[PDB]
Amino acid sequence: AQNGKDLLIKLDLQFETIAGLRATRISFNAETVDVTSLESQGGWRELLGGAGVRSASISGAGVFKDADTDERARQIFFDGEVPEFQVIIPDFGIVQGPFMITSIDYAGSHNGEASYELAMASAGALSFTA
Amino acid sequence: AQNGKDLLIKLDLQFETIAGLRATRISFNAETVDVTSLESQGGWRELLGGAGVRSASISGAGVFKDADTDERARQIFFDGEVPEFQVIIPDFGIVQGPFMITSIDYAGSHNGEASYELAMASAGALSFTA
Amino acid sequence: AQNGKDLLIKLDLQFETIAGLRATRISFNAETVDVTSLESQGGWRELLGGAGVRSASISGAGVFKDADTDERARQIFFDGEVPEFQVIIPDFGIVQGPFMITSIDYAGSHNGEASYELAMASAGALSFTA
Amino acid sequence: AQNGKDLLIKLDLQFETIAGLRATRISFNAETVDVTSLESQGGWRELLGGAGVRSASISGAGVFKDADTDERARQIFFDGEVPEFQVIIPDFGIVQGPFMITSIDYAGSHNGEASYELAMASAGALSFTA
Amino acid sequence: AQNGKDLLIKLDLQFETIAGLRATRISFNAETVDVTSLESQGGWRELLGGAGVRSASISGAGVFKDADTDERARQIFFDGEVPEFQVIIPDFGIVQGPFMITSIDYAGSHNGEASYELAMASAGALSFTA
Amino acid sequence: AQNGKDLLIKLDLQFETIAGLRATRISFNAETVDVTSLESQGGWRELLGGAGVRSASISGAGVFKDADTDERARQIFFDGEVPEFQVIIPDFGIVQGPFMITSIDYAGSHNGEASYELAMASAGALSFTA
Amino acid sequence: AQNGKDLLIKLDLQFETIAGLRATRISFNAETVDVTSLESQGGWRELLGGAGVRSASISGAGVFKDADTDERARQIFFDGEVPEFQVIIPDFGIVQGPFMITSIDYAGSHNGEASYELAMASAGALSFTA
Amino acid sequence: AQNGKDLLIKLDLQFETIAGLRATRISFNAETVDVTSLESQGGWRELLGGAGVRSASISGAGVFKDADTDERARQIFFDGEVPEFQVIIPDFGIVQGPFMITSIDYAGSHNGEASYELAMASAGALSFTA
Amino acid sequence: AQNGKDLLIKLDLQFETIAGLRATRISFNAETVDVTSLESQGGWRELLGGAGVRSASISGAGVFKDADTDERARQIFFDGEVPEFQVIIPDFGIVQGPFMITSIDYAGSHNGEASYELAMASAGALSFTA
Amino acid sequence: AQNGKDLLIKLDLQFETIAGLRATRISFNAETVDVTSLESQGGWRELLGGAGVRSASISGAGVFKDADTDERARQIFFDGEVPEFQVIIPDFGIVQGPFMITSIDYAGSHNGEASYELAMASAGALSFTA
Amino acid sequence: AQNGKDLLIKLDLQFETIAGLRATRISFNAETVDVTSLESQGGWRELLGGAGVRSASISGAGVFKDADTDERARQIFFDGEVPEFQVIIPDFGIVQGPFMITSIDYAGSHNGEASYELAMASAGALSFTA
Amino acid sequence: AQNGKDLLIKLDLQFETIAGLRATRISFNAETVDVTSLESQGGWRELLGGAGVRSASISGAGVFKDADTDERARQIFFDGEVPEFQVIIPDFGIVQGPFMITSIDYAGSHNGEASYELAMASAGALSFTA
């Protein structure tokens, strides 16, 4: 078993995690390049595999606590960059990829928190430190 | 931690917040200009970053209490303008952007309130007072 | 605070509200005419404002109680007209717009009411009595 | 107030209601023929009204009890017809329209009923008996 | 009233029902061939009726209990056929139609069942035994 | 009855199941090649059957426990392959198909687990060991 | 001080109290329409007041003594009506409201009485004679 | 006053009461179909009345004495039926309704009786012999 | 020590306590806005504090003695208001808040009193006179 | 009359009762499949009867005396089985059903017994030996 | 053995216990983050442990004696804070945690005391002085 | 018969029982994975058995006497672990399972003891020494 407190996204400025990090989710994708020739041993769909583009997307939720890493993401959004982002998996290790800052949003209610979602997507080739 | 009572949207007439402000949510966006060349170190999707257009959208909910700032939004809608709007983040600061008044709606039930949603979207270059 | 019992939609025949008026909701819109030139001080989306068309839509729910104003809406639907409709906001005032009768529906169950939704949309220039 | 037990859909064979009639809902529509000229007193959307086509749709739910009127709907579906259907509104009166039998479905579970939905749509000019 | 235990889908091999048959639902359709001429006594939509194609779709849910009729459906899927399927309605009778085996799926959790959905659709002319 | 603990997806490296396997679901498909000629004994839709392509999709949920089979799926994703995957059905048997690793995602919260979904789709002709 | 023997519920047939009236309890309600705007002088919850629906419920206990007023309540239950009911408060006065007969129950033991509870709820606008 | 020994539930086989009948309680219900329109003379809740479904439930307690009427209830439970049940009210009269045998339970202790509860609920239209 | 006879709720008409005041209980609340970030020095739950809404509720029991202050509460209920209410704490002092009259109920038995409960809840910002 | 000492639950190993059997209670259930069509002679709820699933639950209390039948229940719980259980009714006879061992619990105090509850529920079709 | 007079809750102003402290109860919690993988040596539920959030709640009862520490809690409630609270365990030691003042209530009867409950909950990381 | 003084819960540090152990109760559970197919010989509910997850929960009450095993549980709670716990059944034997320390609470009154409840739940696979 691995603690959900262990997997951490973190910005550059040298890497530090953001403050409100209530729920985060790295999500990989591939578009499944269908190569269905007429011949196929039972009429099954055949796929190519390595031809497909592959992606990554980070969706971080949290409560707005002011930190320099939280101010950094605003500066990354206004001065639109694609810097290095890094996401630990507990016992796998970090990812250390270039991402962008696709859509952030700050929210607040009459009774609750200052909360924020932070949605990111892949911008380059990723890595894995094991 | 930051109080959700602190983040406030406010109209011009000089800036004052609207009356029913039950839930508000500034939401930024970027359309992620995909620049996927054939070469990429693992077949990863590459992104450009700063080429993407960037936006902002404000969705304010609340209960209809008559105020001059609430009458102002009706006047902003009928006389269709794009005036300056300003949204505080608690410990970041204000935004102070030109927005429009994209869609408002007043609602009432047989037993509940006169309530209203107020949806806005970005209309120009934004700012940040820190 | 304003009572939800106060905001009232009403038909012409001279104006009278309909019988079952369980939940009603005037909803305004504008389509946000995007004018995004290449220049923009941070790559922000610029909007025009007053060029956008603007609309209104009324969605009234209620229980079927037979009234002359309820029979009027059937006559407005079959003899398809766009007469004047009027919606009070409690402390703002009336709207007094020409609408049509876009979609109505009567519903009933084995145990419940004869209920109806009544969906309307803008058909002309609106007003505001303050 | 009007009882939901009063509003009844009924088939021809002379008119009789179907057996399982748990929830029924006549639903009218019009497609809102937008006539938005450049001139309009506040930039409001103008509509034409009577040019729009108008429709009706009946969605009847119920439990499968075998009746001749329930067998009739199967015969109306296989021998595809558009016969006269009639829906009472409690204190308005009947509708008496030609409809078709667009989609029916029979359902059953390991523990529950033999249930059925019966979806109809308008096929001609409707009426109103007052 | 009719028991939901009575309505049964069944495969050929001679007809036998499948093992896990938790919830099943035959669903008929017609696409409603709109014939809306300019003339129509109130501007009502006119429909043709018998010109529309008509269909049937069976969605059977259940828990995976191994039976020869359950193995048959796998053989019907891999060796893609359109054999005769038969669905009883309690007091109507059987349907006895040619269907295909459009999409099946087996599912299991860490604590629950081996469950399966079985989705079918019409493949020919249907029948009714009364 | 069959235990949901019995149906197991498993990777190659020789086959071993993955660690967190909270909910898994093989899902087959066929696109239903509609062959609707003008003649049909009641206007019923006719289908061809064996002409349709047929597919399979595996959606595995689970909690991130580090295993070599869990590291294998990351290596299958970055070095994009279409290796053999194998899914037991309790009393049917295995499937043993070539699949790809279409989209995986790792997720974690401030209080919960390191969890992951693992979505796969068919890449070749499948099998069945009975 | 006021005698509990004085407060009396009574049916119409002209008003007479029921026979076994061991314990009776009129109970009023309001659902407290919460209008909590973001501003509030100490973060206190603000309420609207008059927007809330208001109700009444009568729970009468007693021993089954046969009377015409006791037979009346059975006739009110089977022929489901909402007639006028009247409840005296000793020195306030009567209420004289339309109620329904929501749930009655007759009970008896091997040694005790024929007893009954009689639960009623508001059905219209109430009154007060002072 | 009426003796609690007089009110008797009784099964069919011709009607005979069950043996252990320590405490019995017929209980009627109606779900109170709320029809609360926006207009109401003091904001009072309005109710419809006759639209509500109405029910009956019998809860019989007693000590297990073997009788043919006690064996009958076991046969009614295993061979699940909805036969006629009849409950006398002392000076009102019988009820004579179709009920089912919803939940029975036999209980015994190391020192006490063989006791049983017998819970029934309405299954059809009831009656009243006066 | 402080006498329970000292703490007194009182209505406006100028403030006077109600007659039967057998047991009274002001009760304050806050909904505890949970702000649990992933970081926390032992995994402890962190809370925000001042963001939570805060309330007050008064539950007064007593015997119905007719007084003008007791008639006032009936008038406050029928003419639904939110007037000022005031509750002394013996050596703290008064509260002097706006409340509503949420649910009152009058009760009487065949042998006991005319008794009443009186339940109130906060409607505005409260105070404290020290 | 029947002795509570006579009704006995008993395990298989051939059937023997457990040691501490202070209070035991077989409890049957049915979920009452509501079939309420719009028509019903007085608006009464109609029920289907035999469509409902039916269950059984055994709750045995007792003091922990070590017996092989008491050790058997621990072995039935750890090696999770659904073996045959048998419950005598004094003059009815046995039940002889397959049950599971849903929840057991051992309890002891500083002064009292080693006591245990043993809760079981139905797992198959039951019987009755008369 | 340890005296219940020894365990004491105490406020800051430097720490002093409150006056009426009739019954007090610190209560800790953890939400038990269920990590139940499909594999488990007997089908047992597996738990993670340290991932769960952990809490504390203090419920203090007492009689209202006016003290500065009792006035402090009112000031902590109106000026909503989360100050340090401290609870001795007799021979363990203090806790010294930040709590809030979630719900207090003052109560009094016609014959008894001015009594109060004081309910608190954890607001931060706690401690232990041993 | 078995003494309640014999069944003992005990912590690790090697195993020792806690000091105040006034009432303790191991409680096992299984969630009863319902596998109710449409076929069942009398419409009885069928269950699977071994698919259900199985649990254990320990609720220990006692008076706070300071011991190293009592200090251990505080250390187990703050440093959140899931160590081995062991519960003797008198003549069965020990259990020896991994549990967590889900919720403890210390309580004291103005006249009584320092008392504590200690609630635990299963965290892994259990055992049985016979």
Residue numbers in the entry:
A (entry chain D), B (entry chain D), C (entry chain D), D (entry chain D), E (entry chain D), F (entry chain D), ...: 3 to 15, 20 to 136
Recite the paper's sentences.
Gene transfer agents (GTAs) are DNA-containing phage-like particles produced by some species of bacteria and archaea. The genes encoding proteins that form Rhodobacter capsulatus GTA particles (RcGTA) are derived from phage DNA, which has been integrated into the bacterial genome. Here, we use cryo-electron microscopy (cryo-EM) to determine the structures of RcGTA before and after DNA ejection, and to visualize the interactions of RcGTA with R. capsulatus cells. Particles of RcGTA have heads with a diameter of 38-nm and 49-nm long tails.
The RcGTA tail contains five discs of tail tube proteins (major tail proteins) (Rcc01691, g9), which are organized as a six-entry helix with a twist of 24.4° and pitch of 38.3 Å. The structures of the stopper, tail terminator and tail tube proteins have been determined to a resolution of 3.6 Å, and that of the distal tail protein to 4.0 Å. The N-terminus, short loop, and loop β2-β3 of the tail tube protein enable its binding to tail terminator proteins. The long loop of the tail tube protein mediates interactions between the tail tube proteins from successive discs and between the tail tube protein and distal tail protein. The part of the tail channel of RcGTA formed by the tail tube and distal tail proteins is filled by a trimer of tape measure proteins (Rcc01694, g11).
